[PDB]
Design a protein around this ligand. Structure first.
Ligand code: ADP
Ligand code: CA
Ligand code: CA
Ligand code: NA
Ligand code: NA
Length: 380
């Protein structure tokens, strides 16, 4: 019997896992990456998904779709959709009060529902798993934010059905993270678990109370617009100014130069989580001028200080809403690729007065890890 898979369908990245050989296995893609961008590109000759899609975003911005999760299960007139649209390079249209992303594909103008774009991302995650398993996958557990309403959950489930998956269950992301650390097995009474999730585009704080396998969301807080994207932007602004000092030229109006710089900034940012410095070398960034420079971890922290600190207020709010004090929290769980930033970990630990942070499972893989566990449980 084929194994069921656990899929973390994130706003910016997705992750797939499977419980086999008595353990959870986070599956790497064709490029050897354990997480895949939630991107879909349409060109004159093909449809690109994942790495291939995000990799050519600078070349084809109007037809490279991302952030489908922000549109999924929402109406076109929804204030959130109306606001989000203003920031995207791709077109969003109204189809019976339902948003649809409109792009050019093979010379023709096509429009797709958010669930259709997400089904493409899910199909890629499903194939990533099938390539590893050696056989076709039919069952899966897909995760969603705790705040997702009935429409958003239905649309997410529909995205899975379109991808050819029997959605065993749609479970909350913070709950999946808890399951990953075995916190669902809570012996002798209630335990409060705080999930600190800082991803690529959103920041979520969830406080759960686990009473013998039964979860209850005590409080949620955060910022749906705060994420790694913001830290990359801080680095972009910094280097744009540095290019001005060193070349007396402003590249801010050249969309391709800014996008390429952003890409290099995200890469340098990731390196800074493991090293105290990172070199940034871009070939022909602007008018044949190469941009070979570097940046220290301290400099990066200074550029993002306010944003890092801002993550503590939602923690304070959540504790206040759950009517609990710091000491009443039994476990702190890190989720999201951005929690890999040392400064972010320091702020949370210091706020919790030296408490241990559950971070043994790669933060950007914890939700998929928990989904894989749950999928296995549901399969028996
Ligand atoms: N080592 C790292 N250091 C800092 N940020 C990282 C690191 N690895 C990944 N990230 C960032 O994590 C974010 C994506 O988080 P992830 O949890 O994988 O996706 P999502 O938020 O969409 O669920 C991106 O902003 C990415 O650059
Ligand atoms: Ca996420
Ligand atoms: Ca932002
Ligand atoms: Na993710
Ligand atoms: Na998040």
């Amino acid at each position: 019997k084929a194994a069921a898979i656990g899929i973390d369908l994130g706003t910016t990245y997705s992750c797939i896992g499977v419980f086999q050989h008595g353990k959870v296995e986070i599956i790497a893609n064709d490029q050897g990456n354990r997480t895949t961008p939630s991107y879909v590109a349409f060109t004159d000759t093909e449809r690109l998904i994942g790495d291939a899609a995000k990799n050519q975003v600078a070349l084809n911005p109007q037809n490279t779709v991302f952030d489908a999760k922000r549109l999924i299960g929402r109406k076109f007139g929804d204030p959130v959709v109306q606001s989000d649209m203003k920031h995207w390079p791709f077109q969003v249209i109204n189809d019976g009060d339902k948003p649809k992303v409109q792009v050019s594909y093979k010379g023709e103008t096509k429009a797709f529902y958010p669930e259709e774009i997400s089904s493409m991302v899910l199909t890629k995650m499903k194939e990533i798993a099938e390539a590893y398993l050696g056989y076709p996958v039919t069952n899966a557990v897909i995760t969603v934010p705790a705040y997702f309403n009935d429409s958003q959950r239905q649309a997410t489930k529909d995205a899975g059905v379109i991808a050819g998956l029997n959605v065993l269950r749609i479970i909350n992301e913070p709950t999946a993270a808890a399951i990953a650390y075995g916190l669902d097995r809570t012996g002798k009474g209630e335990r409060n678990v705080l999930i600190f999730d800082l991803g690529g585009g959103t920041f979520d704080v969830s406080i759960l109370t686990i009473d013998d396998g039964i979860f209850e969301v005590k409080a949620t807080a955060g910022d749906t617009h705060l994420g790694g994207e913001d830290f990359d932007n801080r680095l972009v602004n910094h280097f744009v100014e540095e290019f001005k000092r060193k070349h007396k030229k402003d590249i801010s109006q050249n969309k391709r130069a800014v996008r390429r710089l952003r890409t290099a900034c995200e890469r340098a940012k990731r390196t800074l989580s493991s090293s105290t410095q990172a070199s940034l070398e871009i070939d022909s960034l602007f008018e044949g001028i190469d941009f070979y420079t570097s940046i220290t971890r301290a400099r990066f922290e200074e550029l993002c200080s306010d944003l890092f600190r801002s993550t503590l207020e939602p923690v304070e709010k959540a504790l206040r809403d759950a009517k609990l004090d710091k000491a009443q929290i039994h476990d702190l769980v890190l989720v999201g690729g951005s929690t890999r930033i040392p400064k972010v970990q320091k702020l949370l630990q210091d706020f919790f007065n030296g408490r241990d942070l559950n971070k043994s499972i790669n933060p950007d893989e914890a939700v998929a890890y928990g989904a894989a566990v749950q999928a296995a449980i549901l399969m028996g």
